[PDB]
Amino acid sequence: MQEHYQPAAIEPAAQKKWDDARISNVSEDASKPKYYCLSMFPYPSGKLHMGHVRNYTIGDVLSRFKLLNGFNVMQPMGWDAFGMPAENAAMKNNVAPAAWTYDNIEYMKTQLKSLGFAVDWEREVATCKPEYYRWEQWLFTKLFEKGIVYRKNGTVNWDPVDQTVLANEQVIDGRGWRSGALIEKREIPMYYFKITDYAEELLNDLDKLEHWPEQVKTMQRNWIGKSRGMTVRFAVSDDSKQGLEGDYAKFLQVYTTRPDTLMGATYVAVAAEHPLATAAAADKPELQAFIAECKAGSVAEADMATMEKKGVPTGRYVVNPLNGDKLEVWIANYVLWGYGDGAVMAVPAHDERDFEFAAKYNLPKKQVIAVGDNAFDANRWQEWYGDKENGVLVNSGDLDGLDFQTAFDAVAAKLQSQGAGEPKTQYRLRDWGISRQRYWGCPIPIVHCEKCGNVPVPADQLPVVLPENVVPDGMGSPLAKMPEFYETSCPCCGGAAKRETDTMDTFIESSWYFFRYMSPKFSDGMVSAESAKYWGAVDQYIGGIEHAILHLLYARFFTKLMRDEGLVNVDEPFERLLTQGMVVCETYYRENDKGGKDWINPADVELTPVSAVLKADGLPVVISGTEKMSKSKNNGVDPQELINAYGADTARLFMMFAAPPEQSLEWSDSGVEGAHRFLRRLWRTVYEYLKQGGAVKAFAGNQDGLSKELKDLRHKLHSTTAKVSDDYGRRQQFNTAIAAVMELLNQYDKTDTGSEQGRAVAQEVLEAAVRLLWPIVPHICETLWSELNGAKLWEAGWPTVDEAALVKSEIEVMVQVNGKLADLEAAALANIIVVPGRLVNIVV
């Protein structure tokens, strides 16, 4: 055994030993209990970053911990290959997106293997391969027949200069982020998943997820946005029926979740596309310009609530069916056509948005809810204004004194009696649009024929192979410019027809890849029935918090779709969910030629501890703030440089010890050095122990007769084992488990283990510590274990707690006062000589 710890001399040997034993290549073996630990598979963008290292180290700690506990652990990894990154690099570097993707896959796979992740590479998948996406094309065709997938016209943001469709997040002030040209709203036929058919199931099944973070479940509930409200119809006044047709001439229908406050409505609002808005804007140009502004807007969903709420009066009026008030109709920008009836009512006294809206335009406010003796102020909003739980109605006629639920039912009774309203259930959730006007994505298996219509590609002809021999130029997606691809024959009649040129939303691949891992080479279906029955669901899911809404909802949606097709048995894909934080780092810059900043990468910077310069020379740089690593401010630390400088074990240890998984991880040069220095300490501790006698049989069994010092070391040992086990299994806080082993090594360093019984306890301490740290730093622990013990580490298993080493030994002492019945004197004083161990007498 070499004296000094050298990672490059032990890490490749440890990986070859694990590969030889095939400890990570698992099968559907009914002997050992299964465990499915899954980390979110990455985009093959080129190289790993620190977020990748953090995610897959967390997954490897939990996987190796379960493997040591006797579980048949599957930890698969694949590549979320489709998407825009390959197309942008294709235009920038004049290469094909497929070749660019496959080269990144090979390089990134080498990095993951070098990190020593216990991954079953025989289950590797690449979502851009036809052997993978043929099965989502298959599920598409099956749901298209059932109507779960359907085709209708939608509105997109078209960029006329870059010649492609843009999301709202890519539109800035009505212009494209790259071209800067005004975008054009265009209606085109697109495909949709009818996810709203599963809204109630996707919402209620969240209650089954007892091992999910409360906020992830809360965020999905708000996204689905189920509400139990009331449809209300306000009759249009006879003086406001100009330009109206049909039921819009008779009434204005709205939806409200607060029908208990219907007596407090002071005005109503409609969307820009509403027929009432159209009829009132016929002779008013200010209303026309306001309708145009609402249509031209491209506010993202994450920003719809933070935009300035603006409205315009119409001069049209409607009548409240309860109290008979005549309310003016307003056109507002926060009312969305397609949500409900495209029109709402407004109660400024009990809705904060209506309060700010009414305060802006001096619209009336009518208090109809009271909570205790709290005073009501029409000029200042208070939080109790919106209380649904502890409020009673006021100024509501015969509804006064009623609580929320009974007033709700009373309003429903009155409205249904007049035929002016009825209870109604609504959801904020929209249907899932999956059509993408891009090349590098899964082709939609639809053929357009003028005789047969939109026809799904038959099951025998799947996949519809995306041609890889394409280099996109940036003048429209190539699939629309490639007749050799879209020109085909109709599979129903054999006549001239054209393939669909749009590709699938890349979230589709990430919505079912966890099932494909169970049988990645299965060519008769999405997942073999035998594999899905054995692996069931994912036991542990690890990934970034930014996927808590869309991705997880899509995966839960796809799991229930595949379940109803008879492919899988479970209702939920992920039992336990671990959401990790981001990795942040310092930023550096030199000031610009024209009053600006130019950001420098930290790896090209050297500090003094004060100022900092760049290593190539000595010209100083300005140290700026800390934030998430990104190419925006050039502060991403390449993990390959960290692996080259210190080795894989140091990287893994720093990621786990710097911050808990949920907390943000701050990059620290001083922190990485401490991690590497602790590995040097662990190596020297084992070396110096073996250099003083060699390995012995670890202490086990009756600890009677052991010294107090060695009994105290065993107590710390098995309490550390119990602490680490509860950290890996229950708390999933790994930096405290590292600190717990550090405390065990500290007490070991302070304990004389030179005697024969001492070296047996020292052997027991070291054999436990290297197994307690093996999930985090497996290379050095595997190397040290083989020096301490000849048995296979994974066959020795997770260290067991010795409960006997946790009991404390005191002596039963009797007391007597005047004949009749230091440390022992203070106890018997809290009940003057003392005979050692047996009696104590209190000479009273």
Ligand X SMILES: CC(C)C[C@H](N)C(=O)NS(=O)(=O)OC[C@H]1OC[C@@H](CCCn2cc(-c3cccnc3)nn2)[C@H](O)[C@@H]1O
d(CA 744, CA 681): 13
Which conformational region is residue 793 in: left (phi greater than 0), alpha (psi within -120 to 50 degrees), or beta? alpha
Give phi and psi for 36, each to the nearest 5.
-115, 100
Tokens of 89: 């690099």
Q: Helix (H, G, I), strand (E, B), or coil: what is residue 778?
A: helix
Q: How far is the CB of 443 from ligand X (least distance, A)?
A: 20
The CA dihedral of 162, 165, 171, 173, to the nearest 10 degrees, is 70
Tokens of 211: 């091992």
Judged by CB, which is closer to ligand X: 193, or 678?
193
Q: How far is the CB of 507 from ligand X (least distance, A)?
A: 7
> Under 8 Å CB-to-CB from 169, ≥6 apart: which residues?
300
Which listed range, 81-89, 90-98, 207-215, 230-238, lies at the site for Mg ion (CB under 5 A)? 207-215
In 3D space, the residue among 578, 736, 546 whose CA is nearest the CA of residue 658 turns out to be 736
Q: Helix (H, G, I), strand (E, B), or coil: what is residue 47?
A: coil
User: Crossing angle for the helix pair 639-646 and 97-114, nearest 10 degrees?
Assistant: 30
> Which of Mg ion, ligand X, Zn ion, none has residue 629 at its interface (CB below 5 to 8 Å by kind)?
ligand X
Are the C-beta atoms of 270 and 343 separated by less than 8 Å? yes
Which listed range, 21-29, 201-209, 338-346, 698-706, lies at the site for Mg ion (CB under 5 A)? 201-209
Tokens of 681: 């300490």
d(CA 48, CA 638): 8
> Which of Mg ion, ligand X, Zn ion, none has residue 493 at its interface (CB below 5 to 8 Å by kind)?
Zn ion
Q: How far is the CB of 121 from ligand X (least distance, A)?
A: 17
d(CA 57, CA 654): 10
Residue nearest to Mg ion (CB): 208
Are the C-beta atoms of 277 and 291 separated by less than 8 Å? yes
Q: How far is the CB of 630 from ligand X (least distance, A)?
A: 6
Q: How far is the CB of 446 from Zn ion (least distance, A)?
A: 12
In 3D space, the residue among 437, 452, 575 whose CA is nearest the CA of residue 500 turns out to be 437
Question: β-strand 226-236 against 583-591: which pairing, if any?
Answer: unpaired
> Which of ligand X, Mg ion, Zn ion, none has residue 329 at its interface (CB below 5 to 8 Å by kind)?
none
What separation in angstroms does the CA of 589 have from each of 623, 632, 633, 842? 7, 12, 9, 77
Judged by CB, which is closer to Zn ion: 452, or 613?
452
Site mask, Zn ion, residues 452-481, x = CB under 5 A?
A: x-----------------------------
In 3D space, the residue among 75, 40, 45, 37 whose CA is nearest the CA of residue 55 turns out to be 40
Which listed range, 81-89, 220-228, 487-495, 771-779, lies at the site for Zn ion (CB under 5 A)? 487-495
Diameter of the chain measured on Cα atoms: 116
Which listed range, 286-294, 370-378, 486-494, 558-566, lies at the site for Zn ion (CB under 5 A)? 486-494
Q: How far is the CB of 212 from ligand X (least distance, A)?
A: 16
Please give the single-letter amino acid code of residue 490. Answer: C
Tokens of 156: 């997109």
In 3D space, the residue among 262, 209, 271 whose CA is nearest the CA of residue 555 turns out to be 209
Q: How far is the CB of 208 from Mg ion (least distance, A)?
A: 5
Q: How far is the CB of 220 from ligand X (least distance, A)?
A: 15
> Which of ligand X, Zn ion, Mg ion, none has residue 636 at its interface (CB below 5 to 8 Å by kind)?
ligand X
d(CA 571, CA 557): 9
**Site residue total, Zn ion (CB under 5 A):** 6
Q: How far is the CB of 539 from ligand X (least distance, A)?
A: 17
Q: How far apart are the first and last CA of the chain?
A: 66
- Does position 99 interact with Zn ion (CB under 5 A)? The reply is no
Judged by CB, which is closer to ligand X: 268, or 583?
583
Q: Choose which of 146, 186, 208, 451 interacts with Zn ion (CB under 5 A).
A: 451
Q: Locate tokens 């950001």: which residue?
A: 599
Q: How far is the CB of 641 from ligand X (least distance, A)?
A: 13
Judged by CB, which is closer to Zn ion: 451, or 838?
451
Residue nearest to ligand X (CB): 544
**Would you say the C-alpha torsion 581, 582, 583, 589 has a positive or negative sign?**
negative
- Does position 208 interact with Zn ion (CB under 5 A)? The reply is no
Are the C-beta atoms of 576 and 540 separated by less than 8 Å? yes
d(CA 199, CA 526): 24
Per DSSP, helices labelled H in 309-365 are 352-361
Nearest-5° Cα angle at 585, 579 to 588: 155
Which listed range, 14-22, 200-208, 217-225, 616-624, lies at the site for Mg ion (CB under 5 A)? 200-208
Provide the b/e sequence for 704-714 (b: ≥16 CB within 10 Å): eebeeebbebb
Tokens of 824: 């022992």
What separation in angstroms does the CA of 424 have from each of 35, 230, 257, 340, 738? 44, 5, 9, 10, 54
Judged by CB, which is closer to ligand X: 128, or 741?
128
d(CA 672, CA 653): 8
- Does position 493 interact with Zn ion (CB under 5 A)? The reply is yes
> Which of ligand X, Zn ion, Mg ion, none has residue 492 at its interface (CB below 5 to 8 Å by kind)?
Zn ion
Q: How far is the CB of 56 from ligand X (least distance, A)?
A: 7
Catalog residues that contact ligand X under the rule CB under 6 A: 40-43, 49-52, 55, 80, 510, 543-544, 546-547, 551, 582-583, 628-630, 636
> Which of Mg ion, Zn ion, ligand X, none has residue 451 at its interface (CB below 5 to 8 Å by kind)?
Zn ion
d(CA 660, CA 582): 11
Q: How far is the CB of 159 from ligand X (least distance, A)?
A: 25
Judged by CB, which is closer to ligand X: 350, or 547?
547
Which listed range, 112-120, 493-501, 537-545, 687-695, lies at the site for Zn ion (CB under 5 A)? 493-501
Judged by CB, which is closer to ligand X: 430, or 628?
628
> Which of ligand X, Zn ion, Mg ion, none has residue 519 at its interface (CB below 5 to 8 Å by kind)?
none
Judged by CB, which is closer to ligand X: 665, or 717?
665
Judged by CB, which is closer to ligand X: 50, or 294?
50
Judged by CB, which is closer to Mg ion: 185, or 208?
208
> Which of Zn ion, ligand X, Mg ion, none has residue 43 at its interface (CB below 5 to 8 Å by kind)?
ligand X
Judged by CB, which is closer to Mg ion: 350, or 560?
560
- Does position 577 interact with Zn ion (CB under 5 A)? The reply is no
In 3D space, the residue among 618, 591, 592 whose CA is nearest the CA of residue 605 turns out to be 618
Judged by CB, which is closer to ligand X: 117, or 381?
117
Judged by CB, which is closer to ligand X: 41, or 798?
41
Q: How far is the CB of 39 from Mg ion (least distance, A)?
A: 23
Q: How far is the CB of 141 from Zn ion (least distance, A)?
A: 16
**Site residue total, Mg ion (CB under 5 A):** 1
Q: How far is the CB of 210 from Mg ion (least distance, A)?
A: 5
Which listed range, 205-213, 304-312, 554-562, 812-820, lies at the site for Mg ion (CB under 5 A)? 205-213
> Under 8 Å CB-to-CB from 669, ≥6 apart: which residues?
none
d(CA 371, CA 599): 55
Q: How far is the CB of 39 from ligand X (least distance, A)?
A: 7
The secondary structure of 301-362, three-state, reads HHHCCCCCCCEEEEEEEEECCCCCCEEEEEEECCCCCCCCCCEEEECCCCCHHHHHHHHHHC
Judged by CB, which is closer to ligand X: 50, or 675?
50
- Does position 492 interact with Zn ion (CB under 5 A)? The reply is yes
Query: Number of helices and strands (H, E) in the chain?
Result: 25, 33
Q: How far is the CB of 47 from ligand X (least distance, A)?
A: 10
Touching Mg ion, residues 441-500 (CB under 5 A): none
Q: Choose which of 37, 446, 449, 548 interacts with Zn ion (CB under 5 A).
A: 449
The contact set with Zn ion (CB under 5 A) reads 449, 451-452, 490, 492-493
The contact set with Mg ion (CB under 5 A) reads 208
